[PDB]
PDB file of all heavy atoms in Angstrom:
ATOM      1  N   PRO A   7     -60.203 -17.809  79.563  1.00  0.00           N
ATOM      2  CA  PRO A   7     -59.347 -16.900  80.322  1.00  0.00           C
ATOM      3  C   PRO A   7     -57.915 -17.421  80.386  1.00  0.00           C
ATOM      4  O   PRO A   7     -57.710 -18.636  80.466  1.00  0.00           O
ATOM      5  CB  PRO A   7     -59.957 -16.940  81.725  1.00  0.00           C
ATOM      6  CG  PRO A   7     -61.383 -17.295  81.511  1.00  0.00           C
ATOM      7  CD  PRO A   7     -61.372 -18.252  80.352  1.00  0.00           C
ATOM      8  N   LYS A   8     -56.948 -16.505  80.338  1.00  0.00           N
ATOM      9  CA  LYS A   8     -55.527 -16.844  80.486  1.00  0.00           C
ATOM     10  C   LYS A   8     -54.991 -16.509  81.878  1.00  0.00           C
ATOM     11  O   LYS A   8     -53.840 -16.812  82.193  1.00  0.00           O
ATOM     12  CB  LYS A   8     -54.684 -16.137  79.419  1.00  0.00           C
ATOM     13  CG  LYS A   8     -54.832 -16.714  78.015  1.00  0.00           C
ATOM     14  CD  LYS A   8     -53.711 -16.252  77.092  1.00  0.00           C
ATOM     15  CE  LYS A   8     -53.892 -16.794  75.683  1.00  0.00           C
ATOM     16  NZ  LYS A   8     -54.945 -16.057  74.928  1.00  0.00           N
ATOM     17  N   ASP A   9     -55.830 -15.868  82.692  1.00  0.00           N
ATOM     18  CA  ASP A   9     -55.508 -15.552  84.078  1.00  0.00           C
ATOM     19  C   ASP A   9     -56.808 -15.311  84.835  1.00  0.00           C
ATOM     20  O   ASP A   9     -57.888 -15.253  84.239  1.00  0.00           O
ATOM     21  CB  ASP A   9     -54.628 -14.298  84.152  1.00  0.00           C
ATOM     22  CG  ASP A   9     -53.705 -14.292  85.362  1.00  0.00           C
ATOM     23  OD1 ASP A   9     -53.953 -15.012  86.365  1.00  0.00           O
ATOM     24  OD2 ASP A   9     -52.681 -13.567  85.368  1.00  0.00           O
ATOM     25  N   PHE A  10     -56.693 -15.155  86.149  1.00  0.00           N
ATOM     26  CA  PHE A  10     -57.806 -14.699  86.968  1.00  0.00           C
ATOM     27  C   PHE A  10     -58.280 -13.312  86.503  1.00  0.00           C
ATOM     28  O   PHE A  10     -57.512 -12.579  85.879  1.00  0.00           O
ATOM     29  CB  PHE A  10     -57.379 -14.654  88.433  1.00  0.00           C
ATOM     30  CG  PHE A  10     -57.345 -16.004  89.082  1.00  0.00           C
ATOM     31  CD1 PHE A  10     -56.251 -16.855  88.919  1.00  0.00           C
ATOM     32  CD2 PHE A  10     -58.417 -16.433  89.863  1.00  0.00           C
ATOM     33  CE1 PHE A  10     -56.237 -18.115  89.530  1.00  0.00           C
ATOM     34  CE2 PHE A  10     -58.395 -17.693  90.479  1.00  0.00           C
ATOM     35  CZ  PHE A  10     -57.311 -18.523  90.305  1.00  0.00           C
ATOM     36  N   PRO A  11     -59.525 -12.951  86.812  1.00  0.00           N
ATOM     37  CA  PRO A  11     -60.022 -11.602  86.525  1.00  0.00           C
ATOM     38  C   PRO A  11     -59.075 -10.556  87.080  1.00  0.00           C
ATOM     39  O   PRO A  11     -58.542 -10.718  88.178  1.00  0.00           O
ATOM     40  CB  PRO A  11     -61.359 -11.559  87.259  1.00  0.00           C
ATOM     41  CG  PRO A  11     -61.808 -12.995  87.299  1.00  0.00           C
ATOM     42  CD  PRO A  11     -60.551 -13.793  87.457  1.00  0.00           C
ATOM     43  N   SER A  12     -58.878  -9.490  86.311  1.00  0.00           N
ATOM     44  CA  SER A  12     -57.893  -8.458  86.619  1.00  0.00           C
ATOM     45  C   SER A  12     -58.027  -7.883  88.021  1.00  0.00           C
ATOM     46  O   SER A  12     -57.022  -7.585  88.669  1.00  0.00           O
ATOM     47  CB  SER A  12     -57.975  -7.332  85.583  1.00  0.00           C
ATOM     48  OG  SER A  12     -59.289  -6.808  85.519  1.00  0.00           O
ATOM     49  N   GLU A  13     -59.262  -7.745  88.495  1.00  0.00           N
ATOM     50  CA  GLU A  13     -59.514  -7.148  89.808  1.00  0.00           C
ATOM     51  C   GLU A  13     -59.053  -8.012  90.997  1.00  0.00           C
ATOM     52  O   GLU A  13     -58.981  -7.521  92.120  1.00  0.00           O
ATOM     53  CB  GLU A  13     -60.984  -6.748  89.962  1.00  0.00           C
ATOM     54  CG  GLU A  13     -61.971  -7.903  89.803  1.00  0.00           C
ATOM     55  CD  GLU A  13     -62.484  -8.070  88.372  1.00  0.00           C
ATOM     56  OE1 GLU A  13     -61.673  -8.187  87.431  1.00  0.00           O
ATOM     57  OE2 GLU A  13     -63.717  -8.088  88.181  1.00  0.00           O
ATOM     58  N   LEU A  14     -58.740  -9.285  90.746  1.00  0.00           N
ATOM     59  CA  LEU A  14     -58.308 -10.207  91.807  1.00  0.00           C
ATOM     60  C   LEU A  14     -56.805 -10.421  91.828  1.00  0.00           C
ATOM     61  O   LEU A  14     -56.280 -11.031  92.752  1.00  0.00           O
ATOM     62  CB  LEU A  14     -59.010 -11.567  91.672  1.00  0.00           C
ATOM     63  CG  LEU A  14     -60.546 -11.520  91.738  1.00  0.00           C
ATOM     64  CD1 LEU A  14     -61.046 -12.936  91.582  1.00  0.00           C
ATOM     65  CD2 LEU A  14     -61.067 -10.918  93.039  1.00  0.00           C
ATOM     66  N   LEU A  15     -56.105  -9.916  90.817  1.00  0.00           N
ATOM     67  CA  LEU A  15     -54.703 -10.275  90.649  1.00  0.00           C
ATOM     68  C   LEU A  15     -53.806  -9.861  91.805  1.00  0.00           C
ATOM     69  O   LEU A  15     -52.874 -10.586  92.143  1.00  0.00           O
ATOM     70  CB  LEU A  15     -54.135  -9.750  89.326  1.00  0.00           C
ATOM     71  CG  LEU A  15     -54.794 -10.315  88.055  1.00  0.00           C
ATOM     72  CD1 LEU A  15     -54.209  -9.625  86.832  1.00  0.00           C
ATOM     73  CD2 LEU A  15     -54.631 -11.828  87.922  1.00  0.00           C
ATOM     74  N   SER A  16     -54.109  -8.731  92.447  1.00  0.00           N
ATOM     75  CA  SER A  16     -53.274  -8.253  93.556  1.00  0.00           C
ATOM     76  C   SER A  16     -53.239  -9.225  94.729  1.00  0.00           C
ATOM     77  O   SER A  16     -52.302  -9.194  95.534  1.00  0.00           O
ATOM     78  CB  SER A  16     -53.774  -6.918  94.108  1.00  0.00           C
ATOM     79  OG  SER A  16     -53.792  -5.902  93.129  1.00  0.00           O
ATOM     80  N   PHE A  17     -54.269 -10.070  94.838  1.00  0.00           N
ATOM     81  CA  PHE A  17     -54.395 -10.933  96.007  1.00  0.00           C
ATOM     82  C   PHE A  17     -53.621 -12.225  95.864  1.00  0.00           C
ATOM     83  O   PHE A  17     -53.507 -12.977  96.840  1.00  0.00           O
ATOM     84  CB  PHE A  17     -55.863 -11.289  96.262  1.00  0.00           C
ATOM     85  CG  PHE A  17     -56.776 -10.103  96.386  1.00  0.00           C
ATOM     86  CD1 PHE A  17     -58.008 -10.102  95.736  1.00  0.00           C
ATOM     87  CD2 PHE A  17     -56.431  -9.015  97.177  1.00  0.00           C
ATOM     88  CE1 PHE A  17     -58.878  -9.014  95.863  1.00  0.00           C
ATOM     89  CE2 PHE A  17     -57.285  -7.926  97.315  1.00  0.00           C
ATOM     90  CZ  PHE A  17     -58.510  -7.926  96.652  1.00  0.00           C
ATOM     91  N   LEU A  18     -53.119 -12.483  94.657  1.00  0.00           N
ATOM     92  CA  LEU A  18     -52.549 -13.777  94.290  1.00  0.00           C
ATOM     93  C   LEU A  18     -51.037 -13.752  94.178  1.00  0.00           C
ATOM     94  O   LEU A  18     -50.435 -12.713  93.892  1.00  0.00           O
ATOM     95  CB  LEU A  18     -53.129 -14.225  92.948  1.00  0.00           C
ATOM     96  CG  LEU A  18     -54.651 -14.280  92.879  1.00  0.00           C
ATOM     97  CD1 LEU A  18     -55.089 -14.625  91.482  1.00  0.00           C
ATOM     98  CD2 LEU A  18     -55.213 -15.279  93.903  1.00  0.00           C
ATOM     99  N   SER A  19     -50.425 -14.910  94.415  1.00  0.00           N
ATOM    100  CA  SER A  19     -49.045 -15.114  94.021  1.00  0.00           C
ATOM    101  C   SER A  19     -48.994 -15.585  92.579  1.00  0.00           C
ATOM    102  O   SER A  19     -49.702 -16.516  92.184  1.00  0.00           O
ATOM    103  CB  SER A  19     -48.367 -16.150  94.907  1.00  0.00           C
ATOM    104  OG  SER A  19     -47.067 -16.415  94.396  1.00  0.00           O
ATOM    105  N   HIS A  20     -48.139 -14.959  91.791  1.00  0.00           N
ATOM    106  CA  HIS A  20     -48.032 -15.325  90.388  1.00  0.00           C
ATOM    107  C   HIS A  20     -46.840 -16.218  90.097  1.00  0.00           C
ATOM    108  O   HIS A  20     -46.620 -16.614  88.947  1.00  0.00           O
ATOM    109  CB  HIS A  20     -48.079 -14.063  89.535  1.00  0.00           C
ATOM    110  CG  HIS A  20     -49.381 -13.366  89.678  1.00  0.00           C
ATOM    111  ND1 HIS A  20     -49.576 -12.292  90.517  1.00  0.00           N
ATOM    112  CD2 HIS A  20     -50.597 -13.689  89.190  1.00  0.00           C
ATOM    113  CE1 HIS A  20     -50.849 -11.940  90.481  1.00  0.00           C
ATOM    114  NE2 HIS A  20     -51.492 -12.782  89.695  1.00  0.00           N
ATOM    115  N   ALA A  21     -46.099 -16.559  91.151  1.00  0.00           N
ATOM    116  CA  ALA A  21     -44.920 -17.412  91.032  1.00  0.00           C
ATOM    117  C   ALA A  21     -45.343 -18.882  91.038  1.00  0.00           C
ATOM    118  O   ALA A  21     -45.107 -19.609  92.005  1.00  0.00           O
ATOM    119  CB  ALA A  21     -43.958 -17.126  92.159  1.00  0.00           C
ATOM    120  N   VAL A  22     -45.978 -19.309  89.950  1.00  0.00           N
ATOM    121  CA  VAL A  22     -46.573 -20.653  89.867  1.00  0.00           C
ATOM    122  C   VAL A  22     -45.556 -21.806  89.957  1.00  0.00           C
ATOM    123  O   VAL A  22     -45.924 -22.925  90.318  1.00  0.00           O
ATOM    124  CB  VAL A  22     -47.467 -20.809  88.596  1.00  0.00           C
ATOM    125  CG1 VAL A  22     -48.718 -19.930  88.698  1.00  0.00           C
ATOM    126  CG2 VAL A  22     -46.669 -20.495  87.341  1.00  0.00           C
ATOM    127  N   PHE A  23     -44.287 -21.532  89.647  1.00  0.00           N
ATOM    128  CA  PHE A  23     -43.242 -22.552  89.710  1.00  0.00           C
ATOM    129  C   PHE A  23     -42.497 -22.590  91.048  1.00  0.00           C
ATOM    130  O   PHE A  23     -41.575 -23.386  91.237  1.00  0.00           O
ATOM    131  CB  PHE A  23     -42.230 -22.352  88.576  1.00  0.00           C
ATOM    132  CG  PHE A  23     -42.780 -22.629  87.206  1.00  0.00           C
ATOM    133  CD1 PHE A  23     -42.258 -21.975  86.101  1.00  0.00           C
ATOM    134  CD2 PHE A  23     -43.789 -23.566  87.013  1.00  0.00           C
ATOM    135  CE1 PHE A  23     -42.746 -22.233  84.820  1.00  0.00           C
ATOM    136  CE2 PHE A  23     -44.280 -23.831  85.739  1.00  0.00           C
ATOM    137  CZ  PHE A  23     -43.757 -23.157  84.641  1.00  0.00           C
ATOM    138  N   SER A  24     -42.893 -21.727  91.972  1.00  0.00           N
ATOM    139  CA  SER A  24     -42.185 -21.592  93.236  1.00  0.00           C
ATOM    140  C   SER A  24     -42.176 -22.884  94.044  1.00  0.00           C
ATOM    141  O   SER A  24     -43.146 -23.648  94.037  1.00  0.00           O
ATOM    142  CB  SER A  24     -42.815 -20.488  94.070  1.00  0.00           C
ATOM    143  OG  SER A  24     -42.057 -20.291  95.250  1.00  0.00           O
ATOM    144  N   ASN A  25     -41.075 -23.112  94.753  1.00  0.00           N
ATOM    145  CA  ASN A  25     -40.996 -24.194  95.725  1.00  0.00           C
ATOM    146  C   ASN A  25     -41.610 -23.811  97.057  1.00  0.00           C
ATOM    147  O   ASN A  25     -41.731 -24.656  97.949  1.00  0.00           O
ATOM    148  CB  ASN A  25     -39.544 -24.622  95.943  1.00  0.00           C
ATOM    149  CG  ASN A  25     -39.019 -25.460  94.811  1.00  0.00           C
ATOM    150  OD1 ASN A  25     -39.788 -25.970  93.995  1.00  0.00           O
ATOM    151  ND2 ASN A  25     -37.704 -25.608  94.746  1.00  0.00           N
ATOM    152  N   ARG A  26     -41.978 -22.539  97.197  1.00  0.00           N
ATOM    153  CA  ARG A  26     -42.600 -22.058  98.432  1.00  0.00           C
ATOM    154  C   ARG A  26     -43.926 -22.765  98.657  1.00  0.00           C
ATOM    155  O   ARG A  26     -44.676 -23.027  97.721  1.00  0.00           O
ATOM    156  CB  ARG A  26     -42.834 -20.553  98.379  1.00  0.00           C
ATOM    157  CG  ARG A  26     -41.582 -19.712  98.567  1.00  0.00           C
ATOM    158  CD  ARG A  26     -41.885 -18.238  98.803  1.00  0.00           C
ATOM    159  NE  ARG A  26     -40.867 -17.371  98.215  1.00  0.00           N
ATOM    160  CZ  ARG A  26     -40.954 -16.815  97.008  1.00  0.00           C
ATOM    161  NH1 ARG A  26     -42.021 -17.025  96.236  1.00  0.00           N
ATOM    162  NH2 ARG A  26     -39.967 -16.044  96.568  1.00  0.00           N
ATOM    163  N   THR A  27     -44.206 -23.089  99.908  1.00  0.00           N
ATOM    164  CA  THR A  27     -45.481 -23.719 100.215  1.00  0.00           C
ATOM    165  C   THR A  27     -46.416 -22.690 100.823  1.00  0.00           C
ATOM    166  O   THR A  27     -45.977 -21.759 101.518  1.00  0.00           O
ATOM    167  CB  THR A  27     -45.298 -24.906 101.160  1.00  0.00           C
ATOM    168  OG1 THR A  27     -44.736 -24.443 102.393  1.00  0.00           O
ATOM    169  CG2 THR A  27     -44.278 -25.918 100.607  1.00  0.00           C
ATOM    170  N   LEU A  28     -47.700 -22.854 100.515  1.00  0.00           N
ATOM    171  CA  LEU A  28     -48.747 -21.953 100.970  1.00  0.00           C
ATOM    172  C   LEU A  28     -49.895 -22.774 101.542  1.00  0.00           C
ATOM    173  O   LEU A  28     -49.925 -23.996 101.404  1.00  0.00           O
ATOM    174  CB  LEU A  28     -49.244 -21.098  99.797  1.00  0.00           C
ATOM    175  CG  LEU A  28     -48.263 -20.086  99.196  1.00  0.00           C
ATOM    176  CD1 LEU A  28     -48.765 -19.585  97.850  1.00  0.00           C
ATOM    177  CD2 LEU A  28     -48.018 -18.912 100.145  1.00  0.00           C
ATOM    178  N   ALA A  29     -50.851 -22.098 102.168  1.00  0.00           N
ATOM    179  CA  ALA A  29     -52.008 -22.774 102.731  1.00  0.00           C
ATOM    180  C   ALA A  29     -53.312 -22.128 102.279  1.00  0.00           C
ATOM    181  O   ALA A  29     -54.352 -22.322 102.906  1.00  0.00           O
ATOM    182  CB  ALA A  29     -51.922 -22.816 104.262  1.00  0.00           C
ATOM    183  N   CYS A  30     -53.266 -21.367 101.189  1.00  0.00           N
ATOM    184  CA  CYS A  30     -54.479 -20.791 100.611  1.00  0.00           C
ATOM    185  C   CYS A  30     -54.307 -20.733  99.108  1.00  0.00           C
ATOM    186  O   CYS A  30     -53.259 -20.300  98.620  1.00  0.00           O
ATOM    187  CB  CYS A  30     -54.763 -19.403 101.193  1.00  0.00           C
ATOM    188  SG  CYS A  30     -56.334 -18.670 100.682  1.00  0.00           S
ATOM    189  N   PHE A  31     -55.337 -21.172  98.388  1.00  0.00           N
ATOM    190  CA  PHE A  31     -55.263 -21.343  96.931  1.00  0.00           C
ATOM    191  C   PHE A  31     -56.553 -20.970  96.265  1.00  0.00           C
ATOM    192  O   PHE A  31     -57.612 -20.980  96.888  1.00  0.00           O
ATOM    193  CB  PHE A  31     -54.957 -22.803  96.564  1.00  0.00           C
ATOM    194  CG  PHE A  31     -53.733 -23.337  97.240  1.00  0.00           C
ATOM    195  CD1 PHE A  31     -53.834 -23.954  98.498  1.00  0.00           C
ATOM    196  CD2 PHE A  31     -52.477 -23.202  96.648  1.00  0.00           C
ATOM    197  CE1 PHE A  31     -52.702 -24.428  99.137  1.00  0.00           C
ATOM    198  CE2 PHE A  31     -51.335 -23.668  97.304  1.00  0.00           C
ATOM    199  CZ  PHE A  31     -51.456 -24.281  98.545  1.00  0.00           C
ATOM    200  N   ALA A  32     -56.445 -20.640  94.986  1.00  0.00           N
ATOM    201  CA  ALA A  32     -57.596 -20.371  94.162  1.00  0.00           C
ATOM    202  C   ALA A  32     -57.421 -21.045  92.817  1.00  0.00           C
ATOM    203  O   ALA A  32     -56.294 -21.167  92.307  1.00  0.00           O
ATOM    204  CB  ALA A  32     -57.830 -18.863  93.991  1.00  0.00           C
ATOM    205  N   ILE A  33     -58.546 -21.506  92.265  1.00  0.00           N
ATOM    206  CA  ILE A  33     -58.570 -22.145  90.950  1.00  0.00           C
ATOM    207  C   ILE A  33     -59.639 -21.489  90.102  1.00  0.00           C
ATOM    208  O   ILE A  33     -60.764 -21.312  90.562  1.00  0.00           O
ATOM    209  CB  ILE A  33     -58.869 -23.643  91.097  1.00  0.00           C
ATOM    210  CG1 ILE A  33     -57.718 -24.332  91.834  1.00  0.00           C
ATOM    211  CG2 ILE A  33     -59.116 -24.276  89.728  1.00  0.00           C
ATOM    212  CD1 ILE A  33     -57.990 -25.814  92.148  1.00  0.00           C
ATOM    213  N   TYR A  34     -59.275 -21.112  88.875  1.00  0.00           N
ATOM    214  CA  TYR A  34     -60.231 -20.594  87.894  1.00  0.00           C
ATOM    215  C   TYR A  34     -60.422 -21.670  86.846  1.00  0.00           C
ATOM    216  O   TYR A  34     -59.448 -22.121  86.236  1.00  0.00           O
ATOM    217  CB  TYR A  34     -59.650 -19.360  87.218  1.00  0.00           C
ATOM    218  CG  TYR A  34     -60.631 -18.400  86.579  1.00  0.00           C
ATOM    219  CD1 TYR A  34     -62.006 -18.438  86.858  1.00  0.00           C
ATOM    220  CD2 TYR A  34     -60.157 -17.408  85.724  1.00  0.00           C
ATOM    221  CE1 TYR A  34     -62.884 -17.489  86.289  1.00  0.00           C
ATOM    222  CE2 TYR A  34     -61.026 -16.478  85.148  1.00  0.00           C
ATOM    223  CZ  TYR A  34     -62.377 -16.516  85.447  1.00  0.00           C
ATOM    224  OH  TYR A  34     -63.222 -15.575  84.878  1.00  0.00           O
ATOM    225  N   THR A  35     -61.665 -22.104  86.660  1.00  0.00           N
ATOM    226  CA  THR A  35     -61.957 -23.149  85.682  1.00  0.00           C
ATOM    227  C   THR A  35     -63.434 -23.110  85.296  1.00  0.00           C
ATOM    228  O   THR A  35     -64.135 -22.163  85.658  1.00  0.00           O
ATOM    229  CB  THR A  35     -61.491 -24.532  86.223  1.00  0.00           C
ATOM    230  OG1 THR A  35     -61.555 -25.504  85.170  1.00  0.00           O
ATOM    231  CG2 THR A  35     -62.404 -25.060  87.352  1.00  0.00           C
ATOM    232  N   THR A  36     -63.911 -24.106  84.546  1.00  0.00           N
ATOM    233  CA  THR A  36     -65.294 -24.068  84.074  1.00  0.00           C
ATOM    234  C   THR A  36     -66.254 -24.392  85.203  1.00  0.00           C
ATOM    235  O   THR A  36     -65.844 -24.915  86.248  1.00  0.00           O
ATOM    236  CB  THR A  36     -65.525 -25.033  82.907  1.00  0.00           C
ATOM    237  OG1 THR A  36     -65.232 -26.369  83.342  1.00  0.00           O
ATOM    238  CG2 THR A  36     -64.534 -24.763  81.768  1.00  0.00           C
ATOM    239  N   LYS A  37     -67.523 -24.067  84.987  1.00  0.00           N
ATOM    240  CA  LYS A  37     -68.550 -24.293  85.998  1.00  0.00           C
ATOM    241  C   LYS A  37     -68.649 -25.780  86.339  1.00  0.00           C
ATOM    242  O   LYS A  37     -68.638 -26.154  87.510  1.00  0.00           O
ATOM    243  CB  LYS A  37     -69.897 -23.701  85.550  1.00  0.00           C
ATOM    244  CG  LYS A  37     -69.847 -22.176  85.309  1.00  0.00           C
ATOM    245  CD  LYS A  37     -71.228 -21.541  85.091  1.00  0.00           C
ATOM    246  CE  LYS A  37     -71.837 -21.905  83.736  1.00  0.00           C
ATOM    247  NZ  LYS A  37     -70.987 -21.497  82.577  1.00  0.00           N
ATOM    248  N   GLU A  38     -68.701 -26.627  85.315  1.00  0.00           N
ATOM    249  CA  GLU A  38     -68.766 -28.069  85.524  1.00  0.00           C
ATOM    250  C   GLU A  38     -67.552 -28.636  86.273  1.00  0.00           C
ATOM    251  O   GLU A  38     -67.706 -29.438  87.198  1.00  0.00           O
ATOM    252  CB  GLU A  38     -68.985 -28.794  84.192  1.00  0.00           C
ATOM    253  CG  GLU A  38     -70.452 -28.921  83.798  1.00  0.00           C
ATOM    254  CD  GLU A  38     -70.973 -27.745  82.985  1.00  0.00           C
ATOM    255  OE1 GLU A  38     -70.586 -27.613  81.799  1.00  0.00           O
ATOM    256  OE2 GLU A  38     -71.787 -26.954  83.521  1.00  0.00           O
ATOM    257  N   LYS A  39     -66.350 -28.206  85.896  1.00  0.00           N
ATOM    258  CA  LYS A  39     -65.135 -28.752  86.507  1.00  0.00           C
ATOM    259  C   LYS A  39     -64.939 -28.263  87.941  1.00  0.00           C
ATOM    260  O   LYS A  39     -64.442 -29.009  88.793  1.00  0.00           O
ATOM    261  CB  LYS A  39     -63.894 -28.452  85.658  1.00  0.00           C
ATOM    262  CG  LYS A  39     -63.880 -29.132  84.289  1.00  0.00           C
ATOM    263  CD  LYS A  39     -63.800 -30.647  84.392  1.00  0.00           C
ATOM    264  CE  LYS A  39     -63.973 -31.276  83.016  1.00  0.00           C
ATOM    265  NZ  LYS A  39     -63.453 -32.666  82.982  1.00  0.00           N
ATOM    266  N   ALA A  40     -65.331 -27.019  88.211  1.00  0.00           N
ATOM    267  CA  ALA A  40     -65.219 -26.489  89.565  1.00  0.00           C
ATOM    268  C   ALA A  40     -66.163 -27.202  90.521  1.00  0.00           C
ATOM    269  O   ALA A  40     -65.807 -27.430  91.681  1.00  0.00           O
ATOM    270  CB  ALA A  40     -65.469 -24.990  89.582  1.00  0.00           C
ATOM    271  N   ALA A  41     -67.359 -27.560  90.046  1.00  0.00           N
ATOM    272  CA  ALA A  41     -68.316 -28.293  90.881  1.00  0.00           C
ATOM    273  C   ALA A  41     -67.722 -29.626  91.323  1.00  0.00           C
ATOM    274  O   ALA A  41     -67.837 -30.014  92.489  1.00  0.00           O
ATOM    275  CB  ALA A  41     -69.625 -28.511  90.134  1.00  0.00           C
ATOM    276  N   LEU A  42     -67.067 -30.306  90.388  1.00  0.00           N
ATOM    277  CA  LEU A  42     -66.419 -31.578  90.680  1.00  0.00           C
ATOM    278  C   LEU A  42     -65.221 -31.397  91.615  1.00  0.00           C
ATOM    279  O   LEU A  42     -65.084 -32.095  92.626  1.00  0.00           O
ATOM    280  CB  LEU A  42     -65.986 -32.244  89.367  1.00  0.00           C
ATOM    281  CG  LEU A  42     -65.094 -33.490  89.383  1.00  0.00           C
ATOM    282  CD1 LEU A  42     -65.695 -34.618  90.208  1.00  0.00           C
ATOM    283  CD2 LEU A  42     -64.848 -33.956  87.948  1.00  0.00           C
TER     284      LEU A  42
END
């Protein structure tokens, strides 16, 4: 995947380089890596 599933995109900030700080995050990665 090159992004989160299309149906979730509205919920996310796409400004990945922003200096803005947040307190909620999501990570999309493999099953093995997410478990770790």
